Amino acid sequence: LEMEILKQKYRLKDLTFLLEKQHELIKLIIQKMEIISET
Amino acid sequence: AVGDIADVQKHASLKRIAMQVELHTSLEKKLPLWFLRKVDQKSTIVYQEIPNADKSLEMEILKQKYRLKDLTFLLEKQHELIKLIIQKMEIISET
Amino acid sequence: AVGDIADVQKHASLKRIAMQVELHTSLEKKLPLWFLRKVDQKSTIVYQEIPNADKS
Amino acid sequence: KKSPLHFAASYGRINTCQRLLQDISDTRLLNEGDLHGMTPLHLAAKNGHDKVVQLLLKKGALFLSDHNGWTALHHASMGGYTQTMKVILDTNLKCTDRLDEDGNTALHFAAREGHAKAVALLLSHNADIVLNKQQASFLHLALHNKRKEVVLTIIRSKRWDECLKIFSHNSPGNKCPITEMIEYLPECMKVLLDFCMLHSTEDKSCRDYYIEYNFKYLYEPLTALNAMVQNNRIELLNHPVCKEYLLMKWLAYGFR
């Protein structure tokens, strides 16, 4: 029943592949954002 | 008898190998340094051992955990960063 | 025999220490209060025990 | 009008806040609220805005108001913010502790969700320790949420090791629930007690005691140790430095 856990783990790496790209993408939000006003 | 013998065999291998290493360390220290290399090849030509069944699999989990803390280091900064989205946002119109 | 003895030794330590604590609590209650501290140092000068293998 | 200010200084839109708020109204509505009643001063603290809550305290005022009585600094001690909780508190130490509706104070919330630093700075500014309601102390409410980190930062420094306050019936205090409901916390508390005063060999080390309750009260006497056995935790009990010795010497008369 160790496998059960080995089943969870791959999923969680899929989750960080699906989170890091979001992080990238959000900095990419600010790099094209129109902050004026107000700074 | 059964309880303790079972307990020794549960992690038997270490008891044995710790026997040989202990013996060689307490032999190494007494014998004079000049009688070292030789004897020592520091290499060897190559031309019922130890059981698979004993294992530790808690570590597997200890491997997962660090990763998940890395994930919250990689999520909290995002949260910070998003409030920092709104603090420079141009909401007009419309409020 | 083996099944139950194995079962007792599986968490043996508690059975024992619970023996000594039980005994001291049921000794503490009967003996008169004035015969307390002394005897009690509330400190001690310092000048085959319990197994690692059992775990949760 | 005027509604936006509530929003803007909730999320901390600093320039819109400053240019809208300086008119000057004389802050009749500054000092306004809508259900659930709340003030900008609070909404700044809820979502963490040191900048705006500072500016708003430069203009100042009201400096407190409360619809479910929480005040702002509770909303600060809600999450683990710090700079806010620094400057807000530093403006006045008189307008800092409020016990209602059902008794709580900044320390009590701050030892829930909140991180440890908040608490470290509250002790660094002599926040109330003693006030108790309901029945159970902030430390109680901390451990019943099973938080390691705070109840580890508190014990090193400073103003109590493990404080007094107790009774009844629920929930019994105070160490024995430590041992029932977060084990190994003693371990750290424990090793902090003893000496090994002299270092390596030929050393005689004293062992002070927290354990004794100490009464009289003839109170489930020996008590805490017993509450270790029941229940259950034992890889504190086995801990060498203390318990083993206690029971050993105790076993001297016990022997007799």
Q: Cβ of C47 under 8 Å from any chain D Cβ?
A: yes
What region does D139 belong to: left with phi over 0, alpha with psi -120 to 50, or beta?
alpha
D30: left (phi over 0), alpha (psi -120 to 50) or beta: alpha
Q: Give the Cα separation of D3 and B95 in Å (integer).
A: 9
| Burial label, B52 (beta-carbon count in 10 A; 0-12, 13-18, 19+) | exposed
- Dihedral sign computed on CA atoms, order C1, C4, C10, C14: negative
Which stretches does DSSP call E strand in chain C? none
- D145 vs D67: CA distance, rounded Å: 26
Residue C7, token pair as written in the block: 């079962």
Q: Is B51 helix (H, G, I), strand (E, B) or coil?
A: coil
Which technique was used to obtain these atomic coordinates?
cryo-EM
Q: Which residue has the tokens 């026997």?
A: B19
Which residues touch C41 (CB under 8 Å, ≥6 apart)? D249
Under a CB-based contact definition with an 8 Å cutoff, are residues D118 and D110 in contact?
A: yes
Sign (positive/negative) of CA torsion D66, D70, D74, D75?
Answer: negative
Query: Contacts of residue A39 in chain D, CB cutoff 8 Å?
Result: 15
Contact C45 D232 (CB under 8 A): no
Question: Is-contact D49 D12, C-beta < 8 A?
Answer: yes
**Calculated CA dihedral for residues B36, B38, B40, B45, nearest 10 degrees:** 180
User: Smallest Cα–Cα separation from D211: which of D222, D220, D195?
Assistant: D222
Window D:8-67, CB contacts with A under 8 Å: 13-16
Q: Is D35 helix (H, G, I), strand (E, B) or coil?
A: coil
Amino acid occupying residue D68: N
The answer to whether D236 touches D246, Cβ cutoff 8 Å, is no
Which residue in the set B83, B87, B95 is minimally distant from D7, CB to CB?
A: B95
| Six token digits for residue B84 | 């920092």
**Touching pair A, D by Cβ (3+ pairs < 8 Å):** yes
CA pair distance B7, B22, nearest whole angstrom: 21
The amino acid occupying position A16 is: T
Residue D170, number of CB atoms within 10 A of its CB: 8
In sequence order, the 6+-apart residues with CB closer than 8 A to the CB of B63 are none
And the tokens for D84? 């806010």
Residue A12, marked binder? yes
What residues in D contact B86, CB-CB < 8 Å?
A: 11-13
Kindly give the residue spans of alpha helices, DSSP state H, lying in D22-92. 40-46, 50-59, 72-76, 83-91
Spatial separation of the C-alpha atoms in residues D83 and D49, rounded to whole Å: 8
- 3-state secondary structure (DSSP) of residue B59: helix
CA D153/CA D189 separation, integer angstroms: 11
Q: Which tokens belong to B73?
A: 């280091």
A39 touches chain D (CB under 8 A): yes
- Going from the C-alpha of D135 to that of each of A3, D52, D122, D223, the distances in angstroms are 47, 37, 22, 21
- CB-based contact D121:D86 (threshold 8 Å): yes
Within an 8 Å CB–CB cutoff, is residue D69 touching chain B? no
Cα gap D178→D182, rounded to integer Å: 5
